[PDB]
Design a protein around this ligand. Structure first.
Ligand SMILES: *[C@@H]1O[C@H](CO)[C@@H](O)[C@H](O)[C@H]1NC(C)=O
Ligand SMILES: *[C@@H]1O[C@H](CO)[C@@H](O)[C@H](O)[C@H]1NC(C)=O
Ligand SMILES: *[C@@H]1O[C@H](CO)[C@@H](O)[C@H](O)[C@H]1NC(C)=O
Lengths: 48, 49
């Protein structure tokens, strides 16, 4: 190679890490009554 | 205008005026380069393939 300045590559910085952001979340579902209400129904009284 | 052509008359200046006239010329452009693999693909690896 002769004396000079030459182009050889395009360099590019890869990321160190990853960021996820979503809304200021609210409104949980009423599921806790279905599993752990104080005494479960009979098969005729049947809460849904 | 009407130059009064004459068979035997000549017009000769009795006075003179110095002048300064600007002339403007371009000489160079903005030196430019393009990372074509980034321009085409935007770091999509599959486009880069
Ligand atoms: C909602 O934003 C406020 C103010 O920054 C913060 O106090 C709260 O913890 C956030 N809640 C959630 C679910 O992100
Ligand atoms: C109710 O609470 C107990 C706590 O030990 C848990 O084991 C049970 O699975 C809960 N749900 C039901 C359906 O009983
Ligand atoms: C030429 O014209 C200028 C105009 O300002 C005048 O001042 C001057 O006297 C003239 N010169 C001669 C030598 O006629």
């Amino acid at each position: 190679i002769d004396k000079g300045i030459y182009q050889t590559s395009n360099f590019r910085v890869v990321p160190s890490g990853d960021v996820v952001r979503f809304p200021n979340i609210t409104n949980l579902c009423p599921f806790g009554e279905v599993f752990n209400a104080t005494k479960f129904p009979s098969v005729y009284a049947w809460e849904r | 205008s009407s130059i009064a052509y004459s068979n035997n008359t000549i017009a000769i200046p009795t006075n003179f005026s110095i002048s300064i006239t600007t002339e403007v010329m371009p000489v160079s452009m903005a030196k430019t380069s393009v990372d074509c693999n980034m321009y085409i693909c935007g770091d999509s690896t599959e486009c880069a393939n």
